């Protein structure tokens, strides 16, 4: 029936693009996961290094009393 | 009209499959990164605790010095359905992962400030012992 | 290495030294030691799953910490205490948190003041069930987040505020919140996708308005047929607005029946849609 | 026709998820940002302290 | 209780005009109660109340049809008092009405199923008071009409004023 | 707890000591204490929601910090001042922000300098509405990001630049940016997907184009019919190029209506499409 194959059309087009919008999110999100994935590249960097500077700080201070 | 309503829709179903499948790959990469980024944080946590423990040792010592078309078409539908219902699988997983790391970062930011203020106190309590 | 043992030594340590004990010096050096003791106790208490004991233990170490002058790490201890009581059997879950924020607030730490401010409003609702005090917090908290330009969290909290404000009859005061968070969301080409629901909520929330507050909010919204995300916002709304302007509680209840297929209604929507269905029924046979 | 409307809401079901996921990336924006900057200014105040400590070393060692 | 001074007003909106109910304020009465208006020691009328936060405290609003029946004018003093019916002798069972078109420029001779009318008349005028010789407007399918009680019978004695219940047969 | 009082004490201690006050040493030790004072003041000013007052207070604490020799934590204060003024009634914000960058820049902290730089132009566009000064910043900032290896961010900024450059009329200066951000987007198979819109924009922007500058940007494009994503880029473009080269303000305005079906047109697109829509009419009428 035309009322079926037709309703199907407007429904499928309202099914694919319904994924479009969703697809757009995976686009932006993915672009953000990598974007914010940069800060972590610095976090890991800073953290360990911050421990290096502090470690040298706790050492000198201890030897400054001995 | 039923000829251009089904076919076009078929070319439409094709777009769906690829769009989701091509996005799922990005989803994998996302989860793949979420896993790695998770380790990078489990390595940051070690710092927060390390810094708060060492600074406590510094202060003490410092203060010390101070003081068939509809058939295959329908077949694709069963595929789209199985993929979407699967898109949630990761969608949910990536959710827990985030909520997890997000919580871990909270403990970091907190301690981070406590350590920061402390390191500043040490610096100030260090420029007052010279001489 | 016994909990009670530590608690005891800790007690004998925490006390302003005087007379023979004081000798020549003292003060912070002792009270600090006691703090570390109680913390070490709270540790094994959370071990044996005593919680109550662990929480109160942290309360001890914390309060003592203040007696030394160290609000920072103290407040953090207050947090360990709050988390303890929360996931425990006694109360105090609310007190510890208030005692933590009173510190983070004055110390000039709003970033966190709001972090636990939301946890607070979350417990004062899911536990104490005090929506009127929860909203006050969700709100003031969003104010702080907005100050830190953390628009995101600011919105998270506002969404909570309005969301429960509607359940608390505060419909108009809710739509205002949706209007603000709705206008302060279009700026980001990433919230355009979410900006819908805001308009749907604001267009559903009715302070018993007789004019077209909704017929106007639906218009303020920009929609086109090619939308598929929109099909889950105004398309339905318009059909509900006509179903209200015509006292037809059959077109509204049938439309909610159809719409309840392509997009399920959460508890919130149901409660409000029901409230609107009642504004229609209570107006028809009458 | 059934399998059609059947797949519909299912897809939208994932769309509703991305929504929450999007709300998750925003949280990961506030944290990283401010924190990365704070922890970054840490090495600044930490390095200086290590410097002053060097002086305490050449006068007390 | 025993009676208080009130002032006649106009119906709030056309919405409460198709209910044939005296609109009042929430600060005075409450929707559901019955009252008896007084204009003289011999002219007593009974209406049904319906609250609306638009009415002025200390005054009752009546529709045009009601004012043309009880002889009420916009700006007069009347004494209203609570009236409790006796569901045992004043219950309407068979009431004949003189239906008629309200507007002329819309009077069609087309068929009008009475069953649907007697079903909608009890669905809109239920738990209300009616008197013999009372005039009101009937809204059947958005079509304006006019009613005129000729005779009322209790669930056969004739009653002055009755209470239309759920199992009431209208003719 | 008195802001006014703190603001006074801070003054009484913020002054190069001399005589009996200076003693043997001093200097930075005092001015720092003063900074802490004004900070505490701005803190309660924001507590009472006086913001403006809090902002100017932070301005004082910051300015003082410079007089101590500590550009770092100083600039951070300038930031706080900006967040205050922004979520306040005065307009100051911009100033503070500029004063922040000059520090992060001179110090070498370009990473954060750009982090804020983008927020700068973001305010000079959402507030002062001065795009001419916004683009300059989005650009100079993208240079820093692109220098910090950070390609993604650099692209975010470039997108801002080109995007608003076409609104200001700078079409060619926009297409160049789209071309570059397009060739530097394929090196990441995690961006190929979006590389479309870039070509779509670069081909839509017309500096009174008369030939095939766009037909050339659409031909350089590699569309894969079986790669359905592209259906939101070139396929339309070709039909528009024809509707342009054939002075037909109907085929173009019909194609915009159709494409507006399979793909919702956003603000930007709309504005530009209408501009091209008139370039045809005026040419039909010459």
Curated annotation (Swiss-Prot), chain A:
Expressed predominantly in cerebral cortex, hippocampus, cerebellum, adrenal medulla and retina with weak expression detected in non-neuronal tissues. The record marks 63-64 as: (Microbial infection) Cleavage. Phosphorylated by CK2. (Microbial infection) Targeted and hydrolyzed by C.botulinum neurotoxin type C (BoNT/C), which hydrolyzes the 253-Lys-|-Ala-254 bond. Cleavage inhibits neurotransmitter release. There is a cross-link at residues 62-63, 66 (Glycyl lysine isopeptide (Lys-Gly) (interchain with G-Cter in SUMO)). It comes from the Eukaryota. It is found in: Cytoplasmic vesicle, Secretory vesicle, Synaptic vesicle membrane; Cell membrane; Synapse, Synaptosome. Plays an essential role in hormone and neurotransmitter calcium-dependent exocytosis and endocytosis. Part of the SNARE (Soluble NSF Attachment Receptor) complex composed of SNAP25, STX1A and VAMP2 which mediates the fusion of synaptic vesicles with the presynaptic plasma membrane. STX1A and SNAP25 are localized on the plasma membrane while VAMP2 resides in synaptic vesicles. The pairing of the three SNAREs from the N-terminal SNARE motifs to the C-terminal anchors leads to the formation of the SNARE complex, which brings membranes into close proximity and results in final fusion. This is Syntaxin-1A. The chain holds residues 191 to 256 of 288 of the full protein.
From Swiss-Prot, chains C, F:
Its main location: membrane. InterPro entries: NSF_attach, TPR-like_helical_dom_sf. It comes from the Eukaryota. It is a peripheral membrane protein. The modification Phosphoserine is found at residues 19, 22, 188. GO terms for cellular component: glutamatergic synapse; neuromuscular junction; postsynapse; presynapse; presynaptic active zone membrane; synaptobrevin 2-SNAP-25-syntaxin-1a complex; terminal bouton. This is Alpha-soluble NSF attachment protein. It comes from Rattus norvegicus. The gene is Napa.
Curated annotation (Swiss-Prot), chain D:
Nervous system specific. A higher level expression is seen in the brain as compared to the spinal cord. Expressed in hippocampal neurons. Residues 1-61 are cytoplasmic. It is found in: Cytoplasmic vesicle, Secretory vesicle, Synaptic vesicle membrane; Cell membrane. Keywords: Acetylation, Cell membrane, Coiled coil, Cytoplasmic vesicle, Membrane, Phosphoprotein, Synapse, Transmembrane, Transmembrane helix. One of its GO terms (cellular component) is synaptobrevin 2-SNAP-25-syntaxin-1a complex. Its main location: membrane. It is a single-pass type IV membrane protein. GO terms for biological process: calcium-ion regulated exocytosis; cellular response to insulin stimulus; eosinophil degranulation; establishment of localization in cell; exocytic insertion of neurotransmitter receptor to postsynaptic membrane; Golgi to plasma membrane protein transport; hormone secretion; long-term synaptic potentiation. Residues 3-61 form the v-SNARE coiled-coil homology domain. GO terms for molecular function: calcium-dependent protein binding; calmodulin binding; identical protein binding; lipid binding; molecular adaptor activity; myosin binding; phospholipid binding; protein-containing complex binding. The record marks 30-32, 38-39, 48-49, 53-54 as: (Microbial infection) Cleavage. The keyword Cell membrane applies. Phosphorylated by PRKCZ in vitro and this phosphorylation is increased in the presence of WDFY2. The keyword Cell membrane applies. Belongs to the synaptobrevin family. This is Vesicle-associated membrane protein 2. It comes from Rattus norvegicus. The chain holds residues 29 to 89 of 116 of the full protein.
Swiss-Prot record, chain E:
The modification N6-acetyllysine is found at residue 105. It is found in: Cytoplasm. Required for vesicle-mediated transport. Catalyzes the fusion of transport vesicles within the Golgi cisternae. Is also required for transport from the endoplasmic reticulum to the Golgi stack. Seems to function as a fusion protein required for the delivery of cargo proteins to all compartments of the Golgi stack independent of vesicle origin. Interaction with AMPAR subunit GRIA2 leads to influence GRIA2 membrane cycling. Belongs to the AAA ATPase family. Homohexamer. Interacts with GABARAP and GABARAPL2. Interacts with GRIA2. Interacts with PLK2, leading to disrupt the interaction with GRIA2. Interacts with MUSK; may regulate MUSK endocytosis and activity. Interacts with CDK16. This is Vesicle-fusing ATPase.
């Amino acid at each position: 029936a035309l009322s079926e194959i037709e309703t199907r059309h407007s429904e499928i087009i309202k099914l694919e693009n319904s994924i479009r919008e969703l697809h757009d999110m995976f686009m932006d999100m993915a672009m953000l996961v990598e974007s914010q994935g940069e800060m972590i590249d610095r976090i890991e960097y800073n953290v360990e290094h911050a421990v290096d500077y502090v470690e040298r700080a706790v050492s000198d201070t201890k030897k400054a009393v001995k | 009209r039923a000829d251009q309503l089904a076919d076009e829709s078929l070319e439409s179903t094709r777009r769906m499959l690829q769009l989701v499948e091509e996005s799922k790959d990005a989803g994998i990469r996302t989860l793949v990164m979420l896993d790695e980024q998770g380790e990078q944080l489990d390595r940051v946590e070690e710092g927060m605790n390390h810094i708060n423990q060492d600074m406590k040792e510094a202060e003490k010592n410092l203060k010390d010095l101070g003081k068939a078309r509809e058939n295959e078409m329908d077949e694709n539908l069963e595929q789209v359905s199985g993929i979407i219902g699967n898109l949630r699988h990761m969608a949910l997983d990536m959710g827990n992962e985030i909520d997890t790391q997000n919580r871990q970062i909270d403990r970091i930011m907190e301690k981070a400030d406590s350590n920061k203020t402390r390191i500043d106190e040490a610096n100030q309590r260090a420029t007052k012992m010279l001489g | 290495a016994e909990a009670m043992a530590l608690l005891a030594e800790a007690e004998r340590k925490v006390k302003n030294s005087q007379s023979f004990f004081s000798g020549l010096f003292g003060g912070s050096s002792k009270i600090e030691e006691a703090c570390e003791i109680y913390a070490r106790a709270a540790n094994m208490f959370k071990m044996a799953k005593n919680w109550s004991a662990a929480g109160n233990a942290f309360c001890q170490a914390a309060q003592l910490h203040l007696q030394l002058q160290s609000k920072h790490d103290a407040a953090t201890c207050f947090v360990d205490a709050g988390n303890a009581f929360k996931k425990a059997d006694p109360q105090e879950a609310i007190n510890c948190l208030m005692r933590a924020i009173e510190i983070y607030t004055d110390m000039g730490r709003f970033t966190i003041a709001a972090k636990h401010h939301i946890s607070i409003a979350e417990i004062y609702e899911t536990e104490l069930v005090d929506v009127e005090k929860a909203i006050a917090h969700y709100e003031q908290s969003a104010d702080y987040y907005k100050g830190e330009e953390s628009n995101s969290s600011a919105n998270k909290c506002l969404l909570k505020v309005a969301g429960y404000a509607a359940q608390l009859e505060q419909y108009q005061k809710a739509i205002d919140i949706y209007e603000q968070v709705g206008t302060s969301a279009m700026d980001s080409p990433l919230l355009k996708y979410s900006a819908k629901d805001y308009f749907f909520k604001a267009a559903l929330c009715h302070f018993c308005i007789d004019m077209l507050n909704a017929k106007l909010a639906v218009q303020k919204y920009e929609e086109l047929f090619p939308a598929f995300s929109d099909s889950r916002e105004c398309k339905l709304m318009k059909k509900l607005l006509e179903a209200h302007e015509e006292q037809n509680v059959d077109s509204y209840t049938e439309s909610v029946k159809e719409y309840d297929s392509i997009s399920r209604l959460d508890q919130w929507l149901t409660t409000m849609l029901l409230r609107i269905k009642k504004t229609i029924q209570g107006d028809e046979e009458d | 026709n059934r399998r059609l409307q059947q797949t519909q809401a299912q897809v939208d079901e994932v769309v509703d998820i991305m929504r929450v996921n999007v709300d998750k990336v925003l949280e990961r924006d506030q944290k990283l940002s401010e924190l990365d900057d704070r922890a970054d200014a840490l090495q600044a105040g930490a390095s200086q302290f290590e410097t002053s400590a060097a002086k305490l070393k050449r006068k007390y060692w | 209780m025993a009676g208080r001074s009130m002032q006649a007003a106009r119906c709030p909106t056309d919405e409460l005009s198709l209910s044939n109910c005296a609109v009042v304020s929430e600060k005075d009465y409450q929707s559901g109660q019955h009252v008896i208006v007084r204009t003289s020691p011999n002219h007593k009328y009974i209406f049904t109340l319906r609250t609306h936060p638009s009415v002025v405290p200390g005054s009752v609003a009546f529709s045009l049809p009601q004012r043309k029946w009880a002889g009420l004018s916009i700006g007069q003093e009347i004494e209203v008092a609570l009236y409790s019916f006796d569901k045992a002798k004043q219950c309407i069972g068979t009431m004949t009405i003189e239906i008629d078109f309200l507007q002329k420029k819309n009077i069609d001779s087309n068929p009008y199923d009475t069953d649907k009318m007697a079903a909608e008349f009890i669905q809109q005028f239920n738990n209300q008071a009616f008197s013999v010789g009372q005039q009101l407007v009937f809204s059947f399918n958005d079509k304006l009409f006019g009613l005129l009680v000729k005779d009322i019978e209790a669930m056969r004695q004739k009653i002055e004023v009755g209470l239309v219940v759920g199992n009431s047969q209208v003719a």
